[PDB]
Design a protein around this ligand. Structure first.
Ligand SMILES: Cc1cc2nc3c(=O)[nH]c(=O)nc-3n(C[C@H](O)[C@H](O)[C@H](O)COP(=O)(O)OP(=O)(O)OC[C@H]3O[C@@H](n4cnc5c(N)ncnc54)[C@H](O)[C@@H]3O)c2cc1C
Ligand SMILES: Cc1cc2nc3c(=O)[nH]c(=O)nc-3n(C[C@H](O)[C@H](O)[C@H](O)COP(=O)(O)OP(=O)(O)OC[C@H]3O[C@@H](n4cnc5c(N)ncnc54)[C@H](O)[C@@H]3O)c2cc1C
Lengths: 273, 273
């Protein structure tokens, strides 16, 4: 059941808790006989910006340059930048992809974003035909390990910043679910700048221990594609019948599919129903 | 009433609609006697990645390096990287900041995100004391001009991707409202790869015309800070009384503050109530 796992880290300092959280996981997975691959973006000095350099050879139409087309084509033609391929080879091998990073401006780190924008190529990572539960990565599992500066309360429903589930949605459903991944519960660590030395260790211990059975956890619930007429005809809308039935439901499905009703609960924070 | 405006563009090609949308705005504001400043990030070859190079001189504690502290301090001590200050000077002058960019992975472009993470320094852009409607930029107005590859329907409540409002929330409330900005209605252009030549022009015309009166539009509604006990004591929670009262309300306040109830409407797309 256990095999290869990819750990993507987005942090410049080796003295950070984010780096700790990194080694911990690596150390953990290894003991359980896994095979860990790493993409320490800051270390690799990975390139975040997307440009016509990601492609090799004739640019087809270098006049009215368009990245989406130029790249998915470069992909099939195997003319993609070597540093971008390097990653694909890793993704192709990883069964479990883990993203370690400090929450920055309600989102993912610039350098990480770029990895998404550059690595997750159309044709490889996704296709209008192969979206969400049809995505290419449906056999792989992924989760987010985040480090927050603010406090847990700040993200509660009555907190200043608002529901944390909303924040994760764009990342978990928008990028990972999109591509096909099975999104597991996110590892949330609030304000480590406030947590004392003890807790920090117990947190690393909890981390390690949670990894002993990551592969056996249930994924987060995202609205299944079946509920939609996935065609440019219907406009990719929730099927009339499904809308019909859903009318009898008091709750929405997921954060993005609240359907105007009350949003479930920790739909994006806890895996269950 | 009219004066300086900053336009930040995140697009590599000068042949893109996003570039069109950019000149249009510039051209428009200028006719109305504005003074336009620009930060074509790809052009400027702006640096997106955040690291200890953004600081000049002695790094205080270059042992357990921590970017939040090291930077806000470099800010006050005027020891910030020159390219980062260049922007600050622009922000300080701009009355209206407009962000033009193609939606990428349900978010902002890597290079743009970096600008956020690097330019919006603590002490200048925000402070735990000065957040949201207390933010430093409360006198400036901002809006997002986005270009989507997918179709409008795809983002509807019954669409594959889900409510568009959720997507914008992290950006509009999380970054812009946070810092103090008055967030105006976002300029949404869905799938221009499908819109015909005509529409494209009319869209640019609409754009132009909408700018003749941007400064007079009403901002989007975000839950006012007054509703919270903004202190590390209470944990920045919605005041008990406010919770009390809010109990009689059927709808939540904003996307992030849905308070478990039904989310208003185009709280993030249309400015009104
Ligand atoms: C541009 C930007 C935007 C941001 N936006 C947000 C935001 O929107 N919301 C928010 O909440 N926060 C935000 N932050 C703050 C950020 O989330 C925190 O600074 C970050 O998560 C802290 O994690 P870290 O791994 O860097 O750890 P560090 O700051 O280094 O802190 C780790 C702490 O644990 C100690 N430690 C390190 N290694 C170990 C180990 N192995 N064992 C035990 N103890 C150890 C360290 O000494 C230190 O006290 C932002 C920061 C930046 C720069
Ligand atoms: C990494 C990545 C992630 C993405 N993620 C998403 C996503 O999550 N959701 C999504 O919906 N899309 C996504 N996209 C697609 C992206 O949103 C579109 O490719 C982009 O918005 C198109 O805008 P553009 O300005 O580049 O225009 P272009 O692709 O260049 O297209 C402009 C069109 O208008 C024409 N045109 C150009 N200038 C003018 C002018 N002055 N007057 C009249 N016509 C003109 C052009 O000939 C062309 O047909 C992603 C793309 C990438 C590369």
């Amino acid at each position: 059941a256990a095999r290869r796992a990819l750990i993507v880290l987005a942090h410049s300092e080796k003295t950070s808790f984010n780096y700790a959280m990194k080694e911990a996981a690596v150390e953990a997975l290894k003991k359980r006989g896994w095979e860990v691959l790493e993409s320490d973006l800051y270390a690799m000095n990975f390139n975040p910006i997307i440009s016509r350099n990601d492609i090799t050879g004739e640019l087809k139409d270098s006049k009215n340059f368009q990245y989406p087309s130029e790249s998915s084509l470069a992909y099939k033609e195997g003319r993609l930048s070597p540093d971008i391929v390097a990653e694909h080879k890793k993704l192709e091998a990883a069964d479990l992809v883990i993203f370690q990073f400090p929450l920055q401006w309600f989102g993912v780190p610039a350098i990480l974003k770029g990895w998404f924008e550059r690595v997750l190529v159309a044709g490889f990572a996704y296709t209008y035909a192969a979206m969400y539960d049809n995505g290419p990565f449906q056999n792989k599992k992924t989760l987010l390990s985040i480090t927050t500066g603010g406090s847990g309360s700040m993200y509660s429903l009555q907190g200043v910043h608002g529901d944390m589930n909303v924040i994760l949605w764009p990342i978990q459903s928008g990028i990972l679910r999109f591509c096909g991944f099975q999104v597991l519960e996110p590892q949330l660590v609030y304000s480590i700048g406030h947590t004392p030395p003890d807790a920090r260790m117990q947190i690393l211990e909890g981390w390690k221990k949670r990894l002993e059975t990551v592969w056996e956890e249930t994924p987060l619930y995202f609205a299944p594609s079946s509920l939609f007429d996935l065609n440019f005809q219907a406009g990719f809308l929730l099927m009339k019948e499904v809308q019909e039935e859903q009318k009898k439901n008091k709750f929405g499905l997921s954060v993005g599919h609240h359907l105007g009703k009350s949003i479930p609960a920790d739909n994006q924070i806890k895996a269950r129903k």
